[PDB]
Symmetry: C4
Subunit: 388 residues, 4 copies
Amino acid sequence: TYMNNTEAICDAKGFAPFSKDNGIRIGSRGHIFVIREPFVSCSPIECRTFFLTQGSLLNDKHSNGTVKDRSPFRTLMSVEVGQSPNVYQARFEAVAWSATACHDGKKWMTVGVTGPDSKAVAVIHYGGVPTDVVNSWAGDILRTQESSCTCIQGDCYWVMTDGPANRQAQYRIYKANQGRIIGQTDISFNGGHIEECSCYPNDGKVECVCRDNWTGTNRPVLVISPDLSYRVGYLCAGIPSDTPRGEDTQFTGSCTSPMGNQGYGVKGFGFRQGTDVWMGRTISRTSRSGFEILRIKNGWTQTSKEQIRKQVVVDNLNWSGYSGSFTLPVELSGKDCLVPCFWVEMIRGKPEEKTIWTSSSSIVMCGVDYEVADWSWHDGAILPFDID
Amino acid sequence: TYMNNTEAICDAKGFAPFSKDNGIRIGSRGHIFVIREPFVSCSPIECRTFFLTQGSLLNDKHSNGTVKDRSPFRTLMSVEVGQSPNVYQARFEAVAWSATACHDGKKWMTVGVTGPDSKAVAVIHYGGVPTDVVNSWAGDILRTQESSCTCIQGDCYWVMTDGPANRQAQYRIYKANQGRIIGQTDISFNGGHIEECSCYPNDGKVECVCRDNWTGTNRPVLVISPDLSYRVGYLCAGIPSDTPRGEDTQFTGSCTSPMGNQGYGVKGFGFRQGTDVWMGRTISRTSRSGFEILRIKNGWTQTSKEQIRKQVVVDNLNWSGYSGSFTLPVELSGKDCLVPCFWVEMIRGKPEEKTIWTSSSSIVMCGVDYEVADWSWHDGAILPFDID
Amino acid sequence: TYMNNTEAICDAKGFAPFSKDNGIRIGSRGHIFVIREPFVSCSPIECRTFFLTQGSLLNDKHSNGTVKDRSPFRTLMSVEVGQSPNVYQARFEAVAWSATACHDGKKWMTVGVTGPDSKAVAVIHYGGVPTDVVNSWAGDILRTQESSCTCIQGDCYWVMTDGPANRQAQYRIYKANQGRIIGQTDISFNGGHIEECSCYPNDGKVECVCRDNWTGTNRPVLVISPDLSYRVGYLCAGIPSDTPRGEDTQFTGSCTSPMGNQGYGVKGFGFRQGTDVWMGRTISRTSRSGFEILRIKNGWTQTSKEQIRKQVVVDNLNWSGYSGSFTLPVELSGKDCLVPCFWVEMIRGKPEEKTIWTSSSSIVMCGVDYEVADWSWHDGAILPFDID
Amino acid sequence: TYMNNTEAICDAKGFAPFSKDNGIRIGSRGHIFVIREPFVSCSPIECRTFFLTQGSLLNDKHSNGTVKDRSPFRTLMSVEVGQSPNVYQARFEAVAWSATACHDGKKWMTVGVTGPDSKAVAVIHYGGVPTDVVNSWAGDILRTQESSCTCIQGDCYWVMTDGPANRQAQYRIYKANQGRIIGQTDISFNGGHIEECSCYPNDGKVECVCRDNWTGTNRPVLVISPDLSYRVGYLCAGIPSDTPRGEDTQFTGSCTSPMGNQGYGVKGFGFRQGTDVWMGRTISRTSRSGFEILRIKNGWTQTSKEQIRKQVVVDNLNWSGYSGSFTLPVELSGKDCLVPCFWVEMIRGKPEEKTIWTSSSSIVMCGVDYEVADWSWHDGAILPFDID
Ligand SMILES: CCC(CC)O[C@@H]1OC(C(=O)O)=C[C@H](O)[C@H]1NC(C)=O
Ligand SMILES: CCC(CC)O[C@@H]1OC(C(=O)O)=C[C@H](O)[C@H]1NC(C)=O
Ligand SMILES: CCC(CC)O[C@@H]1OC(C(=O)O)=C[C@H](O)[C@H]1NC(C)=O
Ligand SMILES: CCC(CC)O[C@@H]1OC(C(=O)O)=C[C@H](O)[C@H]1NC(C)=O
Ligand SMILES: [Ca+2]
Ligand SMILES: [Ca+2]
Ligand SMILES: [Ca+2]
Ligand SMILES: [Ca+2]
């Protein structure tokens, strides 16, 4: 039976640990994939960690040079959340150097984008098999979320980017039924830049918090109705949740325009909470180190930095990276609303440590009704490996 | 359909071997987790070994210093009983450096407690996903059984400790429906100390045998009705089943007070048998070596040491450690009552052997209707490993 | 319920990536079988990669001399498509040094041929267990497709060869119900040579494109009704899709006779498309390097080389090998017709590289309704391995 | 639903290969258990390989001295037939240094016998959990088949031995319903010796061919009705199928008495075929080398050596060992009778080869309606391993 992500978000007070794979610590000996983009996404029955492999395993020579972001050996596979991205438990989902995956209550749709930088093709899988195909409309690295895509009453949505990554590019939405592309829409944000959205279903509409990789230290935002009418802009809160970013003291927030004079960025997430927001970000403001989630009073519809709640998930002395959003269906949490959860990717190796390789492990957290003590669930792996 | 742990315990005469993983012997080559607290617990369909990993694997450098009891890499995972705690068969249950897990006849509830020593949070998982959260009420190492928790007609119960470990602390019961905390109760035992209970369902009430880590060489005891009214005290039998302990010759038993002048302790178990008791303990009275189960005539309601039955499971020349209790549901044994089973953790490595590491394997036994020959199912691993 | 491969083929425009195992790249560290003949085949529920092992694993001494095509250690096993042929995920299907496998909508029939070159026996497995047996009728290496066999409304068909491999031999069809041989038929092609057919269900009839290993650089062809009446000949198109082959400039096509003066060959595939054909082949015309698929206008019923569509799957600078055909059932793609898919085997090691061993990995593709950018999904493994 | 092994045996003409694990060849690199007694046994749905591990893995130091037949680390586990006895696919069945296992159409009963030589206990598992316990009645190595046990219409039977192994001992039958011992019977064969029976269901009665380890080179035989009335004796055929044995030329057969003047023996099998027999045996008559199956005209009820059919499964230049019998249920083969299948254990290492270790792999065969070419499916492993 179809799965109804119609409900709003359970207003949540803190975040409690859900899972941790220790993949990289395990990889020293076990047979673990060198991975990246380890996102989470649930079905009426299970939560899964999706990932992108470099076609290799930790502590092997083939993990050499796994910094490179786009290879023909790259594949999207999945394991049950908390389980490390190891060979013998992984399902192959698709070939991909960029991806997204979700469940309509019946089957898993996954989208694997591969091919030459010039014309990349996006391969929709519904229930395992390729069911539809999306070519690069603009011939500059067709790409996608690197996090869960949303499915509201059987129909699934997601955001793709094409064009350069250091200036204006183009941004489309896509819609599908059982792996069938039955709808698309152009996102017009001139002077904007929308990368790797972190989406979730709220109040019937899928809300996204994304990455301005051009000039924004604040995050693109966009709300999507099932008819593809959208509002796109920026997270109103006057607290830059990107990296690199400026200081909280010196920054002006906008619901309409990119702020700061910083290029670059990194994937991130936010959760509306009526009027407030939960927003994640690295602790360091220049490096991908540490992690923490912030609750901003009226941060969702206004430019304030009122900080009701703050919580550290990883300390500033430890490597983080991507983070992303998903929800627990109703058929799982028992809640009467979609529990806001998220994950954090903790990258290790190149280009900051003595390794030929580059991989990440994760730490997932979930919205509960109470506040939770601050701590650090860091990767905890000892580098270099013998293959150095 | 819900599972009725209403029945009393099948009065049992001996204990026959149920499973043995040989994890540590296998770990020398295979990819096995460095583990500890390997408890067992059954559902209407399967029996599972739950465990706590150090986020590492045997014979790898990351297993270095796995004596430390509380790390952020620590996770509760599970395998089918008898199967070793290996990577590729393990389900992730929760992050935890202390835990308990059981099945209400419908789903698995697991409780993983993690976080900083000061304010640890306990994360209830029901059917995999975090469903409820329990903060440290007393800011001193919130912790739990390290063995199966009980579920009587759909509702599950268990015992947590908070406060120091070498003197007075606090002890609560908790109750849940489908991962929902719908009840708690304070256990008042001033001058007592209740650690890591080994519970089982008997006569409708969940009975526990626990660890006095303060002054008792005899074991705290407590019986719980579904309304949270409890009797708490000590195992009446005048035979100290803790470690370290004094001699059986010189010891006076109490149903009310801790006896002996010994600090420290170790997890252990007992089974009421009408009036008698089955109680386990290490053979050595000062060291965690060997193991044996004893039947005491009227040991449950009186201070006698009548020894009807005795049986050695592990010899005094071999390492043991924790032990713990569970039952076979009715939907499994076919019996007309809850078969009393138990397990024994056999620790190896630090601090007694030439290893950077510390792990354990197990040997599970079950209540049968006849007496069973004595023997030793010892870990059987050869240390040190190459990583020494 | 039985599975109806009655429909014709969805006329298709391009081919999009479906899966890629990276087995050989993974094998450097993980425990992967040394394999060959990695074909694909789907059931109403899953797509599987079938393979032939040398009874050994990559980077082990037992993979030494795994060039030899026929050993008693050879076994047909299977994994889910996209998953590498690794030990812990593989199901044993049958013992075999030549094979085929398919699903009647209810169970998997597999055919494993083993034994001495003189009298090899073919062991039909239906649903795992041996159900029927086919002896070598002509005492010269009884063999089969090395690709999917077809099942049209519950009955399954396939093509076997017996006799020499460098001149005239004999060619039979076989038919079965639930693993029962209930029909066979002799294929009379004097002056022809039919090896390793790549079959699929079209318009109710199973069409095959095969390998002339005698004199043909063009491919035998054969269409089979469920009553075993057949048309056999050659792919009309005047474009030689075999290897080695001559140039496209100098070649005359036939629907009746073998053309070219070349011995040898390699497995290959074609798809009728009404009147047109999709045909695969290596890029190199003398070596097993590269890969590409071609659409020929009226290539199916006439001798033309009109090239409507061409697409490179692997570049001429990289090793390929076998390729083969299968379809996505209706109970999977959702399409109203059988989606034409194929696979490519990419061989590595002996006799062209510095290895004691010989294995292959794969890259599968599927018929979509649009054209897809050209690229190379090459094996990507680094040889030699430490065992050199 | 219960499974009816009421039918007689399909009269069969030859034997075709069913599976082969290559465990030892795979073990050189993969994580395979050091094993022995690898028997096969089917349920209404799957065929499984059961085995006894030494609690260790090939090519590890713990496999050192795995000649010893009885250890406390010994465990009975299982995999799907054809699959090697590897860690990550194995289910733990029971602790055991001697065992048997079968399926009543509903669940798997397994019997694991462990303990001290003096009083060994046999632990009946039904559906995984220990359900019943059988003590050594005669205090001399309680033991069992080391092959499949039989289940005729829901009730399961098997043969145990106790007492010495080089002279008179005692032999009982046992009967169970859903793991419940509801029946036993004493087998009186004074001057006889019944070891490790190979049983199967025929004509409603379970027939056994066993091992005289005292004086017989011919095999004990016994037929069992569901009421425990039995005929016990020897295989009438005047062809000694044991090892060591005398020559076929010089030997007189008996249906009543042991013949030959040879001590020792090895597990073996026979199949009645109306009046004829299929009987297996090693080729060598003094060593456990090679293997072959023989059909003897009226061999079942008379002392003749008429040889209608003979077939070699393993050549005299290769190691064999145990062999044993099972059947394919009706719910699997589709046949109208129980297909006679068997397996062969091929031992390697100590005491004949340069290894600290001793293990075996297997090759299973099945009754088909035609004769099958002779060949050798030998273990094929290269010794010694690096750990020598
Ligand atoms: C900065 C451009 C960015 C997208 C905004 O490219 C991604 O950058 C990163 C990263 O760590 O910043 C990791 C991924 O592998 C890249 N993805 C692809 C499809 O190339
Ligand atoms: C002595 C205090 C004891 C609880 C009474 O702490 C446990 O001690 C042991 C042990 O082997 O004695 C092992 C566990 O890892 C510890 N658990 C935690 C949560 O730290
Ligand atoms: C050239 C003869 C050919 C069949 C036409 O034999 C196959 O040749 C090849 C190959 O790579 O060309 C690989 C297989 O292992 C062989 N199969 C068997 C059963 O021996
Ligand atoms: C010769 C006595 C024989 C039984 C007749 O003992 C078995 O002998 C062998 C063997 O290879 O001959 C292998 C087993 O491990 C032994 N089983 C036990 C329970 O010890
Ligand atoms: Ca930015
Ligand atoms: Ca104590
Ligand atoms: Ca040719
Ligand atoms: Ca004998």
